[model samples]
Target: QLLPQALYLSNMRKAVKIRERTPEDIFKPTNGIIYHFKTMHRYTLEMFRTCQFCPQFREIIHKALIDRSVQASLESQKKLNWCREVRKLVALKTNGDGNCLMHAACQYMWGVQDTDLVLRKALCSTLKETDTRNFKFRWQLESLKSQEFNWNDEWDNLVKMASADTPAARSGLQYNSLEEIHIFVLSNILRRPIIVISDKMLRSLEPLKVGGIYLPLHWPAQECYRYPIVLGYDSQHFVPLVTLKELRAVPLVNRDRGRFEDLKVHFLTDPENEMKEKLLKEYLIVMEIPVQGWDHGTTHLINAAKLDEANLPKEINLVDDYFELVQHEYKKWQEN
Candidate 1:
């Protein structure tokens, strides 16, 4: 058809770095290559539509294509700005196989592009084991509710979908597809941060504030040195937002690990004494120390609003003491 021809020509013109595969490769089920040319074709078509019809998404693509230095400075000034390390953002197309969110996440986290089903299974297992009443899970539900989503109904459906072993059983839920809550669940499962960039607001609940970067209600523990998984959401589809360079395979480790690992600390801080809070959080994250309400088994308390020493736990280590210990241990770990 003309559409296929156009899609192929567009894909070729874009020079997408698709690995070569033979006809035998295409028919092989053991290889687990889920993201085929058909997926790329669909993604390309949708992107074209977004460019022609959606001004916001078009603008994002435009910015991503611009000179890296210019885009870096522009993005830094925006509310979505978190990682100054990332100078550019390009949307990596994923398989539109109803598991786009998982696909995007898998690509971002694992550097493997076509393991959406594996990720889905893992999330399903996590959901089954997770406590529904957990504060983090409830917080996610509340957030979804505010966005006009029926959390209870959706949650049940999600569980059902996750339990399905056969394609027929899964087909029902696949039609409805994954939502933002699933992203929260995935992040919780992985114990890593996920950053969702979207131009559209959910259910017309509120006007776009802060360039459509949606952070989870709860942040991952400070020890999560891994970079956040970034996904672009548009028209119920998720695509991984990546940079020109291949992502680091391991969590960042260096002399400045603590400072650099505190990725979202900037957003978490208040206007007053922002630097202090930022530094504290950075130290905690680098040390892999857990604070109350953030990670389990933590005696530490981070009063971002106001640090009231008298009201805090007596057993908590003073910042000066903790910093010295962290510094000493960090040096030791580096040596080993």
Candidate 2:
């Protein structure tokens, strides 16, 4: 499985620098270095496949996927529809030189060009503001714990690296690519929802429902918003997923009239019954659905009460469903 030593020597002989050293001298292991080209090639291939090589390799693959997706959207009718609903999901390319997530966010949030460093600075500042002493952001930290990440350490390292003005510090961000915790922090800072679409999410059975969406805050008390900054992720890089400008101008109820019309909805909560009722009413108003006087229409229930699935409406949907339905309809309308 290995090439002969003569072949290796012949390959090294072509290098002008290696000509000064004897074959014996050249072959001497320094700092545990091995001259096994085949082994190096094999491991490098494995690393490339798993995106462990470097950001450049990952970016190359991600760019290829973006190109292919754009081409597919242009060529295929079905994909065209998919793009319409999701507002023509084309990847807006960004530089692969680290800070890709910030690059994407800057473009989506502010329509600015190459302002990733600014966004990175902003992120560091936001992280610094979190009450680490009193653990005011403990819930956010705990959420990241489930992903096996220690947010406090990561944030400290990121803040330190971002504060420095050096090549090593700049590259440090690349090694420590943005995670969901960072996204959460960003969303809170920006006060907007951030939607992330990725190959991994696409591979999942319910891609539309799961990792495709990211809310800045959780339900019942989430700050409401209509438009979300959408980003495409692949192989550790992020690209902005631009949608049609016209989609935002369209009225909410007109867009999703079918989803809300004539549905008998109920908010099933115990302790905070009044709060749940008010939340349900507010959600209806946001959707522009008229809240009927507690007695008419088919069963369409919201799952805030923690009741068993069987006891709930046969057409039960989470409070997320209300938002997701409009999201789905918006995508569908854009397709049309």
Candidate 3:
């Protein structure tokens, strides 16, 4: 609480620009105003909780938000190669009944789908072209239940004696929460978050002069397999030194995920790295900046055979969950 208290008040006076400017594309599934509200809401809550011990910061309220202008900007600037256009693209920003991020994105590209509207009008109105040839939507409903990878691991076998295919696969299949577990497991294996702080970024405040990269994957931003190692954190939360092997030697950076990425960001964090790490460790949580959301502790890891969603224990995402976050300076002794 003392930590958040200091951060919120410090943020208000502009004495320091709070590291709340999370890019839309990475955190939320899609771009929209709802995310702005979410981002602000989440930051305020974090500030509020930190303010729990301080009364002076109690009245803080995040305000003045709109999705229209910003989302329009993204659409205009972005180049889509998947298909001509996607319809029914919706954003929580415009339709605020607490809709999901993916829902908004779906409507954003492919116009709204009206179940009740007569087939002709629904098709004619929503379709940019009736051809259906120029269209792409992410994750077909059937695909949602499909396995990203079918498995026959030793762990799967142990659980199989008592369950179906593999308790792990079975659970991921049943709940459709693969993304949740995937991120959760990785968090544990990779605990020490790549927090950025001070003048030059580094992963932790403890300060060890070591560097590396770790790539993360999520279906929402589903390009992880390609740019696997574009991940690392600086000892400094603000100005981090980045090294995109494909891009350049090393550059300074501040946040995780971003809107448009060839080396696109998959997440965000600034000076709040200290507090964020605490939350992840003690509370088993991580901030999903786009929606200003949080993924609760280690219980998310998928070892369904050993631990299913219902039975998995809660834990934090840490260094061991991940491999070293690679930077351009790093290379396999074997590769060189």
In every candidate, how many clashes are there?
1, 6, 64
lDDT of 3 by residue, 1-336 (tens): 122212112223221122212122122223311111222111100001212222332222112111333323323432111112111111112222111111122111111211112211212222222221112111122123344442324223322222212234432332111122222212211221221111122246453322222222111122112111111221111111111101111111222332211121212234424443332223222222121112342212110000001111112111111112111112332256
Poorest 10 consecutive residues of model 3 by lDDT? 303-312
Higher-ranked by TM-score: 2 or 3: 2
lDDT string for model 2 (137-183, tens) is 53343444345545545546655544413446445554335565556
Per-residue alpha-carbon lDDT of model 1 for 1-336, expressed as tens digits? 112211122333222222231111222122321211111111111112223324533344344322333234334434122333323354555565676676666554333343325456655555555445553355453454345535545556666565425345344534236654556555544444455655432455443222222223243344432335556655455666543321221122211222322222212324423554443434222223212322355344222111101111212212223234334544554576
Per-candidate Cα lDDT values, in order, are 0.38, 0.38, 0.20
Query: In candidate 1, which residue ranges exceed 4 Å CA deviation?
Result: 1-86, 114-116, 135-154, 163-176, 201-220, 246-336
Q: Which ten-residue region of model 1 has the weakest summed lDDT?
A: 305-314
Clashing pairs in 2: 83-88, 84-334, 84-335, 85-331, 85-335, 268-305
- What's model 1's overall lDDT? 0.38
TM match of model 2 to true structure: 0.43
* Model 1 residue 34 CA deviation in Å: 26
